[PDB]
Design a protein around this ligand. Structure first.
Ligand code: C98
Length: 325
């Protein structure tokens, strides 16, 4: 395959010292978990369980993330990235790192965010609210990309919104990685519905632009009220669902530009599909969230070619955000 690199923040890690990106050599100093009392379970994941908690020394609510120590290298990676991004706009704030004295199970302590139930919010969301929150996510992505970090797991589940205080946080940096130009990454990242075509065609030399495809998937589900937008049943079928919208002509243009070898598993399922107009997804239930600006913005995110998608900074300058601060 033809090599590729990010259009932006290409050399940010190259120009920094080893301490910033060499997470395996990072010294993790675990405090005492006795300062925290667990309140309730907030969620369960493959390698973590998240709890609402109280810091007993200041009577302040926190969030405690207990990690199943399946791979130390992955825990070190998450800790280093959270330490590097600490205090960035709309990035979840790591406040402490603890180990329970008896269990010795690694746990991350974060700032508390009061998540509004999405199912309830989803119905009351306006065109303005979508633009406002999209912009908040973009601030988080432009910042972490500027810091040489790819989140690689952008999805509704990893976005927290406190609608009452119009606060948003991008969470779960467990799959995030440092971007190094020319590096070949593991394509087994992100959640099925949000995986970019680069991952599905096994093109390993991807970059920050993967996050912009995932964001495009979220934008499409939100404005069209179709969750998920690309409803694959497996990773191969996921590409077929994308091809039913973007068409197969542009897919062959993409794999040809990077000299990608399409897996034979695609041979009998891909078929032939025309390029669909974004206006075909407009219906009575969602027309109040759709506008020519939104469709033009969506069209600039949902492109096979990772290099031709808008960067987070270019996305922030799009006319769709001319109504937000
Ligand atoms: O995962 C959790 C629990 C939790 O608090 N987890 C957590 C907390 C703190 C840190 C961590 C961590 O893993 O680092 C995890 N909550 C799920 C929140 C789901 N958010 C729903 C949602 C929010 C915003 C959007 C959205 C809004 C406007 C435009 C586009 C998208 C959507 Cl689609 C969905």
């Amino acid at each position: 395959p033809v090599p590729s690199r990010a259009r932006v923040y290409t050399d940010v890690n190259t120009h920094r010292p080893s301490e910033y990106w060499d997470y395996e050599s990072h010294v993790v100093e675990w405090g005492n978990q006795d300062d925290y009392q667990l309140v309730r379970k907030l969620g369960r994941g493959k390698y973590s369980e998240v709890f609402e908690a109280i810091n007993i020394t200041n009577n302040e609510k926190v969030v405690v993330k207990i990690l199943k120590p399946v791979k130390k290298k992955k825990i070190k990676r998450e800790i280093k990235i959270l330490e590097n991004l600490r205090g960035g706009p709309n990035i979840i704030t790591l406040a402490d790192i603890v180990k329970d004295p008896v269990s010795r199970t690694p746990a991350l302590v974060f700032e508390h965010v009061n998540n509004t139930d999405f199912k309830q919010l989803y119905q009351t969301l306006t065109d303005y609210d979508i633009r406002f929150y999209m912009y908040e996510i973009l601030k988080a992505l432009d910042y972490c990309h500027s810091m040489g970090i790819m989140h690689r797991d952008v999805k509704p589940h990893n976005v927290m919104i406190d609608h009452e205080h119009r606060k948003l946080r991008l969470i779960d940096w467990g799959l995030a990685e440092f971007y190094h130009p020319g590096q070949e990454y593991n394509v087994r990242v992100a959640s099925r519905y949000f995986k970019g075509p680069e991952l599905l065609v096994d093109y390993q030399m991807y970059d920050y632009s993967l996050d912009m495809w995932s964001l495009g998937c979220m934008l499409a589900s939100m404005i069209f009220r179709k969750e998920p937008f690309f409803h694959g049943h497996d990773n191969y079928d996921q590409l077929v669902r994308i091809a039913k919208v973007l068409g197969t002509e542009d897919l062959y243009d993409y794999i040809d530009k990077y000299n990608i070898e399409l897996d034979p598993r695609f041979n009998d399922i891909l078929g032939r599909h025309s390029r669909k107009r974004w206006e075909r997804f407009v219906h009575s239930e969602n027309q109040h969230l759709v506008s020519p600006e939104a469709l033009d913005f969506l069209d600039k995110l949902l492109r096979y070619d990772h290099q031709s998608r808008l960067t987070a900074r270019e996305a922030m300058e799009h006319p769709y955000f001319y109504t937000v601060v």
